[PDB]
Amino acid sequence: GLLNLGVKDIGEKVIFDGKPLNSNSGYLGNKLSVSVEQVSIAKPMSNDGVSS
Amino acid sequence: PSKVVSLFRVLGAIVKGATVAQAEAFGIPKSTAASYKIATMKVPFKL
Amino acid sequence: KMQYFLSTGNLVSQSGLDLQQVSGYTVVAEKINFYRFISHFRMVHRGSFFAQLKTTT
């Protein structure tokens, strides 16, 4: 469905801890690639109190 | 309840769930201690 | 957030969805008449921004 293509289009959002390490100072490193592979939607449900 | 809490805080008392000693002295279930609010005053005056 | 946006119709985002307005996207199904209910789903709007236009072409 269209929405899974949309999240395939958002791609990644990367953030670096300036990933110290002590090229690792002008190329540094430690990549973190955050994305969303699948997106599922479930039909309306209601469970009582909270869980189980 | 909001009025009582606010007024007690204006006096500078500390209001929170009962301690083991407080629950025991007042005879309230320890499980209800955290729900049992107590107002106290200490040495170092409030700011 | 989609309940809110869907409850106001003020869809706003950092790209603007390439759309000329940030309101008017949502309508009450207004079941006062079955004719009105079906009429709602075959109604289409040129958009608020052209409602703002003074001309008639």
Partner: protein
């Protein structure tokens, strides 16, 4: 989505309920369809905005 009128009535609904709308805070709202430029196809337009960009704009 797949209930026959009989079941649909068994669920206290208008035997013919088309649906397509949203219950938000209990108030029935639908998203109004909008007329937008036909996609992917170049539409030749003369617009004074184009001059509104600045000098030397046609």
């Amino acid at each position: 989505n797949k209930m026959s009128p009989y079941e649909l009535v068994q669920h206290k609904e208008e035997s013919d309920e088309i649906g397509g709308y949203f219950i938000v805070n209990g108030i029935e709202k639908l998203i109004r369809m909008l007329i937008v430029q036909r996609r992917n196809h170049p539409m030749a337009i003369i617009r004074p905005s184009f001059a509104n960009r600045g000098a030397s704009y046609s």
